[PDB]
Ligand binder design. Structure first.
Ligand code: MG
Ligand code: MG
Ligand code: MG
Ligand code: MG
Ligand code: MG
Ligand code: MG
Ligand code: MG
Ligand code: MG
Ligand code: MG
Ligand code: MG
Ligand code: MG
Ligand code: MG
Ligand code: MG
Ligand code: MG
Ligand code: MG
Lengths: 63, 107, 131, 394
RNA sequence: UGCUUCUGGGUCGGGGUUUCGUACGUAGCAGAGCAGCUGCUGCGAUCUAUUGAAAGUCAGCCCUCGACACAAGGGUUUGU
RNA sequence: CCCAUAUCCGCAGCAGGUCUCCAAGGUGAACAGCCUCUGGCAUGUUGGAACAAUGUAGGUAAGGGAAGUCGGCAAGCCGGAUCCGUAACUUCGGGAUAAGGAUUGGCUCUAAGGGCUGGCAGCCGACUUAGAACUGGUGCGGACCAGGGGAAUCCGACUGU
């Protein structure tokens, strides 16, 4: 089975983890856990959450 | 070597885990006294009023997680008591608890 | 030939779900579920791919005050697939059909569960996407 | 009058009394029926419940919706370090049932096994089997032994071996070994004894008892849950909120006549810690333990033909509330009874396994080793470090 | 279930894991503006770096064998 | 001297009853609730160890949402304030906080609203209202305090007993 990536945090989801979300507009999201799912559903921007892949890429933390 | 002094860190957090709010700090005083018998094997444990003050410094339920204490086994001066020795427990303020071993203190 | 596996049932009798077809109904009110033998005190319940009996509460006046066969195509209650995936939809949706599973309408809005899609070829052909 | 609307009764009257098991170690109530034509083999084994994980595999079920497709399946990891055979016991069939006939123990018995014979090892002088062991050193005693073995050949019909676990290799606090009789099914009675006599004091790896894809039964004691009410113990309907004097009760515990409470009515009492036997638990993998080969520790007992990572079954942080599985393990599909650390009796099937599910061959594509102490999201520490990057600790 | 094989568990420490979400202090010519002196100096929620940081983490998580002491004990009974 | 969760009446040191005076700071419309100073107390006729069932009093629950029940009983939703908006009917007073929306933090500023002295000048000031920028993970009446609503039928006008 192929690995996904959390639609909020950027962490990769191995088989048997998280939840897959499907909106009425057709877009499908995957969430590593409920911590990531809650932030996404509360309309939080991952770029502003310090521990996400999108934040660290925007701030060059790894680089 | 009956008269001896050592400095300990007591993990109060794990001693009072799961205890009710109105009994958390009363029970820490009990777990400190119980700790003293185990380490020094003396029924007569005497907890200093500063250590009692430190343990209650944050109220009845948010007790400090770790506390550094000094145990000093001393000779019971009164011959009326059945106990020849007692243990005195004093507070040792520490800016940090990291890497603190159990230390022998020599006066 | 291949049989659908059990999934969590999220729509007990008495649930009002959206109507995801162009018939005219705006929602579907579940009054029973096909294939439910049940037991004492337990409400019949439905999941994606289940045919149900429902009434239209909001919609065309000609569609109301009567019982329609409907199939659930989306549900908000997450259900496990045999590949270990827990999937759930933003809303609960159904489509009116007849006994034979042919859609009373001609188009669907929103995605359709793969569980319901594989079970109803007439419904699948009208689905914009499959989830 | 008759009850208005029908309903099946709650619970099974077949598992009564709902009491605390009198034994901690699962007891094999029935060993498989002996087939003399089969070669000599053992029929049971003792394992410990390490904990659960989940795997990925490709199912081969023609006509299924999951044929040639991947599926995630839960598994239980049962640590099964090799057992040590210490004694042989023979039985005689009588018109009153099997009667224990003769018991012969090995010359050497380790301290893990001798602990079993004591309620306090600390206060004991460790005198168990001290005078007996001399029967193996002197000729007269030896001549008496092979007379005992010959009598077991003449008269006995069921041969069992006394195998105990090796607790020193397990991560648990307990040092007292678990000692059980295992029946020796297989050839004639003479063949059973020679095979067993050879194995006195020897070790039996689990792989010699069970094999890949085998359907076995797990016998153990469920997780104790203490005093429980009828609602939790018997799963009866909860009474309305307006009920006076409590609602987690059975309202009518009987009719006026018979003027007694019947044995078939739900009551409050013990829940859990019940002896149970569960059948048809497939073996998904028999894993080899850690081996020091050529000065390097081999521990990749969780790699598969598709996941070449050098990782062991142990999840990050170890098995929660158990420890580290460094011995041979059995990966069983689904769940089994007991808490972590619970000793489980593995037994061979009493049935004939002719079903596509029973005969299906397992080919694991992936074994999950993420932490179970939270929501672990990394399979290995190397995978974690490569993703995270250097930290302030370094 | 454990209670001397330089061995045993215990306590502290450390490491692993994991939860939250980036510590105090310090610097900033980042900061909507405002006050004072002739660009500088003050007030300023907030922001950035230090800093996936700080803090907790078995009390019923996992591994140590670094520190410290303790452990060869006590009571009541039992005989073909 | 007590004057009342122990000096009075209730068989008692009884969660009941029993007439009054004085009355601080903060928040806030407030003698509300919440915290605090002066003053007072030792948890209400016992303690210790556990944390089973069943209770009593509080909470939280995925998906559904009264399918429960005689009956929405119980709980829950709403709730402050500012700006907007508001029907039938009506005895024209009401209905009405009808119904229905938006807003609310912190911080830095701007504008208006006065007295005293000798269309101007100087000195004093007390809280308000309104607007703007910036700002935080959209959190902001952050605790406390704090109306669910609508359409109808019966009866009794209402307030009161
Ligand atoms: Mg019913
Ligand atoms: Mg009948
Ligand atoms: Mg009642
Ligand atoms: Mg877990
Ligand atoms: Mg009280
Ligand atoms: Mg008292
Ligand atoms: Mg009193
Ligand atoms: Mg009382
Ligand atoms: Mg709910
Ligand atoms: Mg919900
Ligand atoms: Mg009804
Ligand atoms: Mg009914
Ligand atoms: Mg009510
Ligand atoms: Mg009205
Ligand atoms: Mg009236």
């Amino acid at each position: 089975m192929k690995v996904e990536l959390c639609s909020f945090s950027g962490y990769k989801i191995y088989p048997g983890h998280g939840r897959r979300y499907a909106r009425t507009d057709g877009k499908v999201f995957q969430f590593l856990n409920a911590k990531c799912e809650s932030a996404f559903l509360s309309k939080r921007n991952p770029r502003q959450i310090n521990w996400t892949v999108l934040y660290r890429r925007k701030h060059k933390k790894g680089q | 070597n009956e008269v001896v002094t050592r400095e300990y860190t007591i993990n109060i957090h794990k001693r009072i885990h799961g205890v009710g709010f109105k009994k958390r700090a009363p029970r820490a005083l009990k777990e400190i006294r119980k700790f003293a018998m185990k380490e020094m094997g003396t029924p007569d444990v005497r907890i200093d009023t500063r250590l009692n003050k430190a343990v209650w410094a944050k109220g009845i339920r948010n007790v400090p997680y770790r506390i550094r204490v000094r145990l000093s086994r001393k000779r019971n001066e009164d011959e009326d008591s059945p106990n020849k020795l007692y243990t005195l427990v004093t507070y040792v303020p520490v800016t940090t608890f990291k890497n603190l071993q159990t230390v022998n203190v020599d006066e | 030939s291949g049989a659908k596996f059990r999934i969590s049932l999220g729509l007990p009798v008495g649930a009002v779900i959206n109507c995801a077809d162009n018939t005219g109904a705006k929602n579907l009110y579940i009054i029973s579920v096909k294939g439910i033998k049940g037991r004492l005190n337990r409400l019949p319940a439905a999941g994606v791919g289940d045919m149900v009996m429902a009434t239209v509460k909001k919609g065309k006046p000609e569609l109301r005050k009567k019982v329609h066969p409907a199939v659930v195509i989306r549900q908000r209650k997450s259900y496990r697939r045999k590949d270990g995936v827990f999937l759930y939809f933003e809303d609960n949706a159904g489509v009116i059909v007849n006994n034979k599973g042919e859609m009373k309408g001609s188009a669907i809005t929103g995605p359709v569960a793969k569980e319901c899609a594989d079970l109803w070829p007439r419904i699948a052909s009208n689905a914009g996407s499959i989830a | 009058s008759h009850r208005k609307f029908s309903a099946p009764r709650h619970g099974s009257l077949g598992f009564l009394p709902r009491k605390r098991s009198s034994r901690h170690r699962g007891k094999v109530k029935s060993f498989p029926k002996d087939d003399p034509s089969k070669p000599v083999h053992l029929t049971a084994f003792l394992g410990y419940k390490a904990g659960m994980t989940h795997i990925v595999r490709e199912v081969d079920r023609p006509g299924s919706k999951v044929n040639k497709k991947e599926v995630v399946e839960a598994v239980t990891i049962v640590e099964t370090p090799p057992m040590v055979v210490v004694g042989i016991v023979g039985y005689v069939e009588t018109p009153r049932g099997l009667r224990t006939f003769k018991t012969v123990f090995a010359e050497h018995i380790s301290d893990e096994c001798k602990r079993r014979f004591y309620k306090n090892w600390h206060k004991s002088k460790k005198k168990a089997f001290t005078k007996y062991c001399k029967k193996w050193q002197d000729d007269a005693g030896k001549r008496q032994l092979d007379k005992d073995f010959s009598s077991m050949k003449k008269y006995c019909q069921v041969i069992r071996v006394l195998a105990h676990t090796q607790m020193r290799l397990l991560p648990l606090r307990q040092k007292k070994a678990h000692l059980m009789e295992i029946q020796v099914n297989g050839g004639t009675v003479a063949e059973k004894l020679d095979w067993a006599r050879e194995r006195l004091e020897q070790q039996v790896p689990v792989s010699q008892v069970f094999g890949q894809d085998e359907m076995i039964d797990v016998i153990g004691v469920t997780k104790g849950k203490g005093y429980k009410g009828v609602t939790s113990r018997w799963h009866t309907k909860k009474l309305p909120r307006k009920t006076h004097r409590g609602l987690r009760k059975v309202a009518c515990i009987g009719a006026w006549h018979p003027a007694r409470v019947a044995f078939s009515v739900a009551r409050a009492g013990q829940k859990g810690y019940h002896h149970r036997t569960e059948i048809n638990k497939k073996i998904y993998k028999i894993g080899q333990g850690y081996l020091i080969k050529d000065g390097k520790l081999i521990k990749n007992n969780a790699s598969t033909d598709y996941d070449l990572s050098d990782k062991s079954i142990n999840p990050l942080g170890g098995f929660v509330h158990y420890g580290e599985v460094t011995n041979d393990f059995v990966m069983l599909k689904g769940c089994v009874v007991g808490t972590k650390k619970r000793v489980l009796t593995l037994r061979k099937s009493l049935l004939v396994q002719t079903k596509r599910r029973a005969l299906e061959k397992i080919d694991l594509k992936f074994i999950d080793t993420t932490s179970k102490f939270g929501h672990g999201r990394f399979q290995t520490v190397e995978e974690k470090k490569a993703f995270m990057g250097p930290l302030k600790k370094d």
